Curated annotation (Swiss-Prot):
This is Coagulation factor V light chain. The lineage of its organism: Eukaryota, Metazoa, Chordata, Craniata, Vertebrata. Residues 2-157 form the F5/8 type C domain. The chain holds residues 2065 to 2224 of 2224 of the full protein. Glycans are attached at residue 145. Disulfide bonds join 2-157. It comes from Homo sapiens.
Length: 160
């Protein structure tokens, strides 16, 4: 089958493979680095937080080789007295990491907007019908509650 978690939570996807447009750095050593965006992560800093909340943000995952990506799970983050989570997002993909292509349905001309989270720890899973075949995946937050924060996991399999 093709529904195996690709490695965000279990750490098979290494820190070096996860990057972002920007990330929050607190005056006192709290860096919400991209690679902290792992499903179910706990800790003082357990998620990626964009440096600024605007339409120019993205979290990128380099799978190191082209794979078939069948689903994605996103989760939010509760930090202090603040509930932050991405409510909707689009997906961009690439085989080379140079040219980016937006995920769109067959009878579509606009980017497919995926429904995201409605709380901080609940898992929201979205299936890609059809699957995405690529090496790089970018999650583009469209709407968020309070602040852009994410914890995620990707599911797929190798190409044969």
């Amino acid at each position: 089958g093709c529904s195996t978690p690709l490695g965000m939570e279990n750490g098979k996807i290494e820190n070096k493979q996860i990057t972002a447009s920007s990330f929050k750095k607190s005056w006192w050593g709290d860096y919400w680095e991209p690679f902290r965006a792992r499903l179910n992560a706990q800790g003082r800093v357990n998620a990626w937080q964009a440096k600024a909340n605007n339409n120019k943000q993205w979290l990128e995952i380099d799978l190191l080789k082209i794979k078939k990506i069948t689903a994605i799970i996103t989760q939010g983050c509760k930090s202090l007295s603040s509930e932050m989570y991405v409510k909707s997002y689009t997906i961009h993909y690439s085989e080379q990491g140079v040219e980016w292509k937006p995920y769109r349905l067959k009878s579509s001309m606009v980017d497919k907007i995926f429904e995201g989270n409605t709380n901080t720890k609940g898992h929201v899973k979205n299936f890609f019908n059809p699957p995405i075949i690529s090496r790089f995946i970018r999650v583009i937050p469209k709407t968020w509650n309070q602040s852009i924060t994410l914890r995620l996991e990707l599911f797929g399999c190798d190409i044969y």
